[PDB]
From a paper:
DNA Gyrase, a Type II topoisomerase, relaxes the positive helical turns by introducing negative supercoil in the DNA and prevents the overwinding of the genome. The essential functional role of [name]-CTD β-pinwheel fold is to wrap DNA and present G-segment for enzymatic action.
The StGyrA-CTD structure was solved by molecular replacement method using the E.coli [name]-CTD (PDB ID 1ZI016) as a template. StGyrA-CTD adopts the β-propeller fold comprising six repeated subdomains referred to as ‘blades’ to form a β-pinwheel structure. Each blade of the pinwheel constitutes a four-stranded antiparallel β-sheet structure (A, B, C, D) linked by a 15 residue extended loop. The [name] box region from residues 560 to 574 is an extended β2-β3 loop which could not be resolved due to poor electron density map signifying that this region is completely disordered. The electrostatic surface potential of StGyrA-CTD revealed that the positively charged residues are distributed uniformly around the perimeter of the β-pinwheel across all blades. The basic charge on the protein surface is largely contributed by the arginine and lysine residues present on the extended β2-β3 loops of all blades. This indicates that the DNA wraps around the perimeter of the StGyrA-CTD β-pinwheel structure during G-segment presentation. It was observed that arginine residues, R556 (blade), R612 (blade), R667 (blade), R716 (blade), R766 (blade), and R817 (blade) could be identified as the potential DNA binding site in each blade.
Author numbering: 536 to 560, 575 to 839
Write the structure that this text describes.
Amino acid sequence: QEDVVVTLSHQGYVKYQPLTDYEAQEDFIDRLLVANTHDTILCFSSRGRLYWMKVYQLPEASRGARGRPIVNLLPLEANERITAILPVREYEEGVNVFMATASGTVKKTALTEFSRPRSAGIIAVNLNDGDELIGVDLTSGSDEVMLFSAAGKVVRFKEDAVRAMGRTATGVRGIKLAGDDKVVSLIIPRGEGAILTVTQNGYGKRTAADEYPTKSRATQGVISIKVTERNGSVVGAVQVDDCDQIMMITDAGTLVRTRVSEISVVGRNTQGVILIRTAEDENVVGLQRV
């Protein structure tokens, strides 16, 4: 079973809705989740903290309705955004939480290490100044990990390469980042869906997942897309199936939805095609799979 849909918007309004009613009848859905009313959600923030919430503590609101600001439900600091929401019925055994920071560190902790909530939240990974927790997902012990950087680099390695650490551990380096570069996306590749990447000035592309070679961790990585001044930096990458849609938002509030099947499937050593035509000082700031 899975009863309701949890949504967290780009502006930080959170709500839930029974999914039957969610199926029937600016701001975009930044995280979507499916769970029971009495499931727990682990809310991981950009500051590297973790909060526990019962789904029923969220507002039940219709799909037109706005929801409640999550800053009013969690003890969030200034500019502390929710970067992951993970649903847990039972802290399933043999399942890992994998985390990735902008500075290229990664961390793997068993799900069960989070079975004891603290209402003030905990530190899920200690961060330095300016470093951010940019990705969290669940792995099974036998998954691969892909880290995507702003400069068009990607590293792909088996999750075995990261020793399962304790809840307090500081984490190891997942990718070697040159100079200004930062990790922007984490992907646990599953299935045959292609990798879609988009840049700041609206270029992007699909590349078959099997064309991303499995390297070792803590290397410099290979190229995922050629980043130029025309291109702009990589904003994000997601795995999509051919019937999926993506949504992109610029810092000018322009929202574009696009069916993935219309985006060309090319190699890693390209600049991409235009997915959204940005103005001169407009930059893509958000990518999300629908």
